[PDB]
Amino acid sequence: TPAFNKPKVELHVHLDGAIKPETILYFGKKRGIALPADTVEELRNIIGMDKPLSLPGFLAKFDYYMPVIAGCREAIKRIAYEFVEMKAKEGVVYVEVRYSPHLLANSKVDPMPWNQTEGDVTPDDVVDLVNQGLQEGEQAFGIKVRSILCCMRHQPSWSLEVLELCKKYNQKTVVAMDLAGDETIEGSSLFPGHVEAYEGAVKNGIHRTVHAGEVGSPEVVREAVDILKTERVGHGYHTIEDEALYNRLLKENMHFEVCPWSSYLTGAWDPKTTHAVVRFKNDKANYSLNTDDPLIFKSTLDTDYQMTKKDMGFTEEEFKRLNINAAKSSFLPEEEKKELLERLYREYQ
């Protein structure tokens, strides 16, 4: 019995953290690349988490399977296709899915991720391949899907390139740039490559989101906002530890991309305290609900809606409010955005 059985908008979910175990197993066998398990079940149970870990334990889960997807054209297009399939079944009508094109390439990329052999798949290739899969997904499942390209905190040397890729594939299907990875890499918001890329983004009207305040202090949110010029903050739970900053962002109508279930398993929320999102609901904050990494968190959007309903008092009305807010905060050009709001309102009747 699903918590919100109506159209939803998702703004924060990683393609490489939302792949079917079956597809991972398939490509592991086909390529003859090692996996940590040999059946869907056990794969799902070693890759997945049912208990909170630390951030290093969380990120480590990717090492398990990334090697079988990365460098593989067929897999890249396929996981993007299958991404749309999964979400359409979740009752999502618009979603922005994000990934690092560099992390799936095996050519013209340095350092070489996952220790791959030089192949022929460039980070440009990657974007194209995800575009094709998502576009095919749309044609097949009938929901709207856009992509966001992630800068990686530890790798500021890839950032200007991520910006070129958002420019080259603008709206087809790239709508924005993100900054993801290890948030506690001290002073990393200020690495010249990220700073320069975000400045390049502001100048070219390339939309901007920034992972901040998931585990970082509110300072890291402040940097995202005042230095990187972000339009949305990924996570941002810790923003409320700074009354002034928080209240500033409320008034500017900052968007917080909230991942309830995720925040629990990454240990980014201490379960013994009120979730930050409860404060967001009570303050009429602008935020969305997101699965983040459904493969690793063994979840779908419902997990998150179920969570906030059973545990945080969320009502049909608030679910409605927040998806309308997510629509308005989406990175869709003005006309498509009006169409989305138009469809939500008709379907919330």
Swiss-Prot record:
pH dependence of activity: Optimum pH is 6-8.5.
Q: Name one GO molecular function term.
A: zinc ion binding
Cofactors that this protein relies on: Zn(2+)
Give the reaction(s) catalysed: adenosine + H2O + H(+) = inosine + NH4(+); 2'-deoxyadenosine + H2O + H(+) = 2'-deoxyinosine + NH4(+); cordycepin + H2O + H(+) = 3'-deoxyinosine + NH4(+)
State where Zn(2+) binds: H12, H14, H211, D292
Q: How is the cofactor bound, as the UniProt entry phrases it?
A: Binds 1 zinc ion per subunit.
Q: Write down the NCBIfam families for this protein, in alphabetical order.
A: aden_deam
- The name under which this protein is listed is Adenosine deaminase
Classification from the root reads:
Eukaryota, Metazoa, Chordata, Craniata, Vertebrata
Annotated gene:
Ada
